[PDB]
Amino acid sequence: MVFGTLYTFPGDQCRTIAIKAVAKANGLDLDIRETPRTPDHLSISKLGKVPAFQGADSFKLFECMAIALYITSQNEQTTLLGKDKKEYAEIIKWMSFFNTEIVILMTQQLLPQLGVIPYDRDQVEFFANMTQRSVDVVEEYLQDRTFLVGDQLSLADLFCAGNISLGFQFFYGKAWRQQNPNVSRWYEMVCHQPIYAAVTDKFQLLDEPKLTNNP
Amino acid sequence: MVFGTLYTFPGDQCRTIAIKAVAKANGLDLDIRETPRTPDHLSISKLGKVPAFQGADSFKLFECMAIALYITSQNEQTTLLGKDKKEYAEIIKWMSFFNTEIVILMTQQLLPQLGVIPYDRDQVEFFANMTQRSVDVVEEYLQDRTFLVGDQLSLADLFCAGNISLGFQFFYGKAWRQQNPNVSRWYEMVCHQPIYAAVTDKFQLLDEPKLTNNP
Numbered sequence: 552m553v554f555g556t557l558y559t560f561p562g563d564q565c566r567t568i569a570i571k572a573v574a575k576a577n578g579l580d581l582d583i584r585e586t587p588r589t590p591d592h593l594s595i596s597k598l599g600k601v602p603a604f605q606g607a608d609s610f611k612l613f614e615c616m617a618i619a620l621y622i623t624s625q626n627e628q629t630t631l632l633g634k635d636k637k638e639y640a641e642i643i644k645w646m647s648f649f650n651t652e653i654v655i656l657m658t659q660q661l662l663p664q665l666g667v668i669p670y671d672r673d674q675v676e677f678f679a680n681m682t683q684r685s686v687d688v689v690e691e692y693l694q695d696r697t698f699l700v701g702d703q704l705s706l707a708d709l710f711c712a713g714n715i716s717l718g719f720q721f722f723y724g725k726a727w728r729q730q731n732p733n734v735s736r737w738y739e740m741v742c743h744q745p746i747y748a749a750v751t752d753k754f755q756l757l758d759e760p761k762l763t764n765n766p
Numbered sequence: 767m768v769f770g771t772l773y774t775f776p777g778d779q780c781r782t783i784a785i786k787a788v789a790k791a792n793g794l795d796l797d798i799r800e801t802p803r804t805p806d807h808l809s810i811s812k813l814g815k816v817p818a819f820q821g822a823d824s825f826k827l828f829e830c831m832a833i834a835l836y837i838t839s840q841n842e843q844t845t846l847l848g849k850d851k852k853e854y855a856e857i858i859k860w861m862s863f864f865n866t867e868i869v870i871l872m873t874q875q876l877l878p879q880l881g882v883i884p885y886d887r888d889q890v891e892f893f894a895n896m897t898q899r900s901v902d903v904v905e906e907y908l909q910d911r912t913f914l915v916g917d918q919l920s921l922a923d924l925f926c927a928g929n930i931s932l933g934f935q936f937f938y939g940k941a942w943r944q945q946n947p948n949v950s951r952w953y954e955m956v957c958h959q960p961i962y963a964a965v966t967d968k969f970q971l972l973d974e975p976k977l978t979n980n981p
């Protein structure tokens with residue numbers, strides 16, 4: 552049957568992509584609800600947050616790290632969670648760093664520029680630079696690394712790549728990628744991994760950013 | 767020997783307490799560096815963030831979820847990570863919810879009121895209410911629950927309780943706890959668990975908040 556239901560947004564969502572990806576790779580069918588905050592969704596996430604999950608099990612879950620790990624752990628033969636205890640902890644590290652130090656800061660750079668949230672050129676400039684100072688850590692770490700953790704694809708590669716896809720959607724044009732070659736290579740590499748390509752729209756990159764910090 | 771070194775702040779820190787707690791419970795000695803951002807600390811966390819960890823191993827880690835899980839997983843007999851795959855995912859859920867939807871929002875309520883960060887009565891009021899709307903979820907969930915996950919103490923109880931201790935330090939006086947009985951009971955219960963009491967200053971609660979949203 553269907554393994555469970557996943558509440559999300561239409562298309563590719565930065566906190567959802569890995570969840571779709573490892574579900575397919577683990578052979579778990581999912582019912583994708585692309586309409587958020589129905590009675591069913593609030594039953595899981597009272598604050599109405601995407602992603603939210605409920606199994607056929609009828610087991611309930613928010614948050615994205617928890618859902619991704621849950622679905623992944625289903626296959627006991629998976630190689631997406633590290634060789635050993637250290638690589639696992641490392642997978643946890645990158646997943647938490649990307650989700651709090653990159654997505655949360657990039658969100659406050661972005662929403663004002665879409666008119667969701669009040670706009671202040673200086674607030675937005677702050678977040679843009681705080682977001683990039685966190686991405687700079689990854690650029691640097693990836694100097695002469697292929698994968699975020701260990702020597703093969705992990706959940707961190709999938710989950711993090713899906714996270715940072717927010718920036719490739721709006722801000723990271725050719726210039727930015729010239730300037731940030733390792734993150735760009737690694738991101739473009741994870742996007743072409745079949746597990747990840749299978750559950751996403753066609754790969755596409757900005758030429759110029761869709762956004763600069765104008766209102 | 768010492769199992770590793772932990773960079774933190776002096777005294778009880780909301781993202782550090784569980785890490786100390788499960789290290790002791792697992793019989794791992796830790797060298798506690800209470801002076802952040804030395805050359806050694808930046809070697810782990812280039813952004814200078816607490817907690818950061820390095821084993822005698824010389825294995826390196828930030829972020830707090832990753833460190834806590836790493837140290838905990840050391841004992842293969844631990845009961846702090848759930849009976850099964852669901853309870854594990856649940857432990858991951860509460861750890862991520864407390865760390866992003868409570869600590870991050872409570873931080874922006876708090877820092878302006880300490881003068882770390884610019885102050886705007888309305889910005890602070892926003893965060894205060896967004897912080898409480900996330901805590902309300904826990905109040906509600908804990909109605910007729912003892913532990914966050916399963917039927918015994920887990921890492922989520924320890925880690926989350928340490929997180930929310932920020933609020934008990936500054937904002938949550940007798941009034942607040944009258945108003946929010948389940949979170950209060952559960953917090954006060956985790957603080958009296960010996961594993962957690964062992965690595966903290968004496969238990970103490972506000973009468974009146976140390977802070978209201980004045981500058």
Ligand SMILES: CC[C@@H](C/C=C/C1=C(C)C(=O)[C@]2(O1)C(=O)N[C@@](OC)(C(=O)c1ccccc1)[C@@H]2O)SC[C@H](NC(=O)CC[C@H](N)C(=O)O)C(=O)NCC(=O)O
Nearest residue numbers: 565566599600601602614615616655658866867870871896
């Ligand atoms: C970037 C992709 C996300 C879109 C974000 C939307 C968003 C809105 C709208 C919004 O109000 C905000 O982000 C948010 O959710 N909280 C927010 O305002 C309080 C914020 O600044 C913040 C949150 C947490 C910590 C610090 C600041 C911000 O303005 S993905 C869709 C959203 N998902 C999540 O937020 C899940 C997060 C959780 N940690 C997890 O599963 O990992 C979402 O559902 N937003 C709708 C909403 O009303 O909250």
Ligand SMILES: CC[C@@H](C/C=C/C1=C(C)C(=O)[C@]2(O1)C(=O)N[C@@](OC)(C(=O)c1ccccc1)[C@@H]2O)SC[C@H](NC(=O)CC[C@H](N)C(=O)O)C(=O)NCC(=O)O
Nearest residue numbers: 651652655656681780781814815816817829830831870873
């Ligand atoms: C609440 C206990 C924390 C104290 C927070 C201090 C703090 C300062 C100072 C600061 O600038 C800020 O919080 C921060 O770190 N980033 C911040 O500004 C960009 C912010 O608003 C934010 C961060 C992330 C997502 C959204 C917003 C905010 O003003 S604990 C000590 C601090 N630890 C961490 O931040 C670790 C977080 C990581 N996810 C993890 O290990 O889990 C710390 O070291 N702060 C110092 C600093 O300069 O960053």
Ligand SMILES: [Co+2]
Nearest residue numbers: 687690730731
């Ligand atoms: Co650079």
Ligand SMILES: [Co+2]
Nearest residue numbers: 902905945946
């Ligand atoms: Co109430």
